[PDB]
Design a protein around this ligand. Structure first.
Ligand SMILES: NC(=O)c1ccc[n+]([C@@H]2O[C@H](COP(=O)([O-])OP(=O)(O)OC[C@H]3O[C@@H](n4cnc5c(N)ncnc54)[C@H](OP(=O)(O)O)[C@@H]3O)[C@@H](O)[C@H]2O)c1
Ligand SMILES: NC(=O)c1ccc[n+]([C@@H]2O[C@H](COP(=O)([O-])OP(=O)(O)OC[C@H]3O[C@@H](n4cnc5c(N)ncnc54)[C@H](OP(=O)(O)O)[C@@H]3O)[C@@H](O)[C@H]2O)c1
Ligand SMILES: [K+]
Ligand SMILES: [K+]
Lengths: 295, 291
């Protein structure tokens, strides 16, 4: 076939989604409240639909990419547009909860629309590339039928199961890692700022040292999955040296008036693990001490 | 040159093996001497005391719990007289003031000093990727570049000022712990949403380069003062905060300790309270100071 495809939301992402569809030779129609933010996509060859309704019935698949499900829900569940959803495919690529996916599934189905709920595990620069990862959950047929449309967004766009909440559950897990790393960087930058270290140096040192962290994270997951909490020949780090080295960071942050709210959080997990006889056990032991302290 | 390693831990053992593999006469000491016996068979000499170890070799690499422990091994009246003409390489984790103090005391006993941060797990010592940052005097590094190359292909001298290594160590380890506590969270979520950790594993493999781009971008942008949104930003604060809500709610609901994420929240809210809701993620770097 080669359908017409609509994108609702011309944000930073969404704009990317749209450009990636234009670059693969799909007729792409775009709507955005604050329509001036959608003008750039006109020049790249998209048609700028004046309203949601015009957009959702100008195309046979509709990709949504706005703030949250609350905003999706006010665009698509309006009496204005709900009648037009018949036979269309809604692909909800906005960040949401698994209950949010299950609700949006049920109301789209109730208006004669097919539903795919998706988590974009990728920044704008990755949409269009063979590396671009988007996880989609929902019915299989509407995915299988349009594999060509999904390939235009990324080479690593995958269908992961029937149950439509699955994509967002996974999204929340992966985003937990992403924020850990990023708030790690925010700390790293605050330390460098305090000890008058050029961030260029931090940059070129992270380039070199990132693979070590990747090994460490991968190890955490492998070991936790296997219940290998006790120290053994294969562990690369025990809690003792982590906690020992960590002290030096706390003291530095205390001295330099850097917010400790986050690291005091780490401390509490360490101390919980050490309170059980885990001082000299693999870093993965910490995974058993993730629940709330008070009971 | 004969080379001594004090501390045959998990690391240190690695340091020792890497020296033996490059054909250095390596002597090793460890309290609880049975933990150093394995290195005998790979060709190390297990010195019964610290003193015998530090005057059996001309460079001494230290790798124990903390500077307090280094200081009780080397500043004992037993051994301090033997430190003359030696090079102490302190590769144990410590503070920058700790480096500056250990510099001054070693110099006062006629010893040369390099303070080092090992930015690598044991498996990376011996490999071209192995990264160790050394600060201290240049000559004692330059003179022994071959000894450092045996520990890693990415072993660097970064400045005269001897605290520099540990300052940088604390910054880099902040990133490392961010990621790892990120994983611990990611695992708690997976456990709650009945996701097999294998799935998390193979999804992080795929998705890690995205995070690497994001972290590298943070640093490049912060260094350049590019806090305001522009054509080149891949993420603004708004969508981060929006998606973050879904994580907080999940952890609240599943009785997962929120001490950490409430910490993130506070930084977001501080950035948003200034007109930075739709600015690059890097803007958050300006809201890292206390209350
Ligand atoms: N940025 C990334 O790298 C990335 C990656 C993965 C996931 N995501 C997800 O992708 C989505 C898009 O993020 P983004 O970076 O594109 O954000 P953004 O540039 O800040 O734009 C948000 C978009 O949502 C629209 N919107 C917001 N509130 C709305 C409302 N109440 N009613 C209608 N439309 C509304 C905006 O229209 P207006 O112009 O009128 O505000 C705009 O099109 C988010 O759900 C985010 O969680 C983003
Ligand atoms: N593991 C890593 O990947 C890694 C990363 C970078 C740097 N480091 C740093 O390297 C150092 C060692 O780490 P590790 O993994 O080897 O820790 P570890 O396996 O627990 O070993 C600690 C070593 O320090 C010795 N030690 C501790 N307190 C001592 C004292 N009071 N007197 C004498 N020796 C003492 C221990 O002696 P005993 O064995 O008899 O107890 C042992 O040899 C730490 O500063 C750590 O922060 C480690
Ligand atoms: K979604
Ligand atoms: K050190």
């Amino acid at each position: 076939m080669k359908p017409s495809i609509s994108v609702l939301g011309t944000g930073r992402m969404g704009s990317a989604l749209a450009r990636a569809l234009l670059q693969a030779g799909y007729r792409t129609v775009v709507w955005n409240r604050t329509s001036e933010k959608a003008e750039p996509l006109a020049a790249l060859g998209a048609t700028v639909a004046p309203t949601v309704r015009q957009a959702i019935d100008a195309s046979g698949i509709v990709i949504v990419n706005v703030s949250d499900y609350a905003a999706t829900s006010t665009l698509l569940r309006a009496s204005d547009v709900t009648p037009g959803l018949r036979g269309k495919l809604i692909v909800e690529l906005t960040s949401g909860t698994p209950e949010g996916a299950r609700e949006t599934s049920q109301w789209t189905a109730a208006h004669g629309a097919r539903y795919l709920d998706g988590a974009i595990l990728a920044t704008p620069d990755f949409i269009g590339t063979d590396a671009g990862t988007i996880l989609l959950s929902g019915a299989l047929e509407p995915f299988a039928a349009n594999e060509d449309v999904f390939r235009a967004l990324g080479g690593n766009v995958q269908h992961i199961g029937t149950e439509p909440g699955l994509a967002n559950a996974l999204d929340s897990a992966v985003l937990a890692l992403m924020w850990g790393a990023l708030f790690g960087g925010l700390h790293a930058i605050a330390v460098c700022r305090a000890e008058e270290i050029d961030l260029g140096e931090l940059g070129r040192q992270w380039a070199a040292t990132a693979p070590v962290v990747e090994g460490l994270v991968a190890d955490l997951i492998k070991r936790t999955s296997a219940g290998r909490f006790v120290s053994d020949a294969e562990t690369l780090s025990s809690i003792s040296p982590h906690y020992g080295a960590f002290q030096h960071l706390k003291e530095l942050m205390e001295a330099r008036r850097i917010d400790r709210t986050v690291v005091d959080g780490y401390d509490a997990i360490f101390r919980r693990a050490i309170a059980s006889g885990h001082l000299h056990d693999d870093f993965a032991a910490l995974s058993q001490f993730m629940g709330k302290a008070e009971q």
